[PDB]
């Protein structure tokens, strides 16, 4: 409720007169750091291509992952692409497809 040095804590925004720290609305908005924003930030919705991994809280935006069938790597900024269903002609599977990676193959 009390700002310190004109910044409010994570999960809160500052009031218009700079004297109150107001809680973000859980499941609707968030702030992750000590800020002087007059508004909390809008939570990202995992619409169609992506399913929700973790919900939005006041201090944390929601985290998405691609649905089963598609994958994206660890810190990969790339868009989400389809997993192969089988290895090419003359190779074997040594790893299954997840949200995290493609199927892994190897020769003979």
């Amino acid at each position, epitope marked *: 409720s009390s700002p310190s040095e004109g910044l409010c804590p994570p999960g809160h925004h500052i*009031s*218009e*007169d700079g004297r109150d720290c107001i809680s973000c609305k859980y499941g609707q908005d968030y702030s992750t750091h000590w800020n002087d*924003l007059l*508004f909390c930030l*809008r939570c*990202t919705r995992c619409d169609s291509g992506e399913v929700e991994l973790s919900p939005c809280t006041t201090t944390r935006n929601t985290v998405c992952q691609c649905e089963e069938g598609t994958f994206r790597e660890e810190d990969s*900024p*790339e868009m989400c692409r389809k997993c192969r269903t089988g290895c090419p002609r003359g190779m074997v599977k040594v790893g299954d497809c997840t949200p995290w990676s493609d199927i892994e193959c190897v020769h003979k």
Partner: antibody
Amino acid sequence: EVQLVESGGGLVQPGGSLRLSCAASGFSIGKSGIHWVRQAPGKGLEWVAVIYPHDGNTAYADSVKGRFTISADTSKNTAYLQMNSLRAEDTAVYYCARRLALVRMWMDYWGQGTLVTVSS
Amino acid sequence: DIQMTQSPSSLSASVGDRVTITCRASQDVSTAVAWYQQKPGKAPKLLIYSASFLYSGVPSRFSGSGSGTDFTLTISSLQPEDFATYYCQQSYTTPPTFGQGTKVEIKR
């Protein structure tokens, strides 16, 4: 959803007057404020003014000081830029944006903008 | 008051490329810097505020860094939606001032 809609643009003579309005929806102007920013055709962004309607506090670009006046009507959730003594060089798209922060001039939810042309 | 100088004026790049836009203040502005994106016929959008913090709905391939004089916007892997003009802003003092823009076009 937040939305800002500029109106009032048009072609006027040098020395003339124009009043821009910015209708806000989805948030209280009284709990934040509004910025005006302009982009001359083919150029970059030049901030012109801000208003904090809670305490009536205003600030202006040096280019614009004494000639433009920013005001607000919290009952109508609208801000206005009264532009007087207009010069050719004021020609630009004028955007309004919401005051996102208490001290910093961070701007979000910019409107589509309104074109102001000053010519004889 | 304070000039912000962006560099480069323009660059061409491919989808996937790492892109680095730099802004230089003529004075110490600490971390009081934002970055904006603008596409033709459209209004600017906030990407980043206070030098390194992402605005709502901005993907994680966007990164801001810097303090004092030298600031940086990074796009780790360029996407089709990322070809636009980018503008730095300082808000350390009134009036806030903008760089002249970096146009990011597509290489073919």
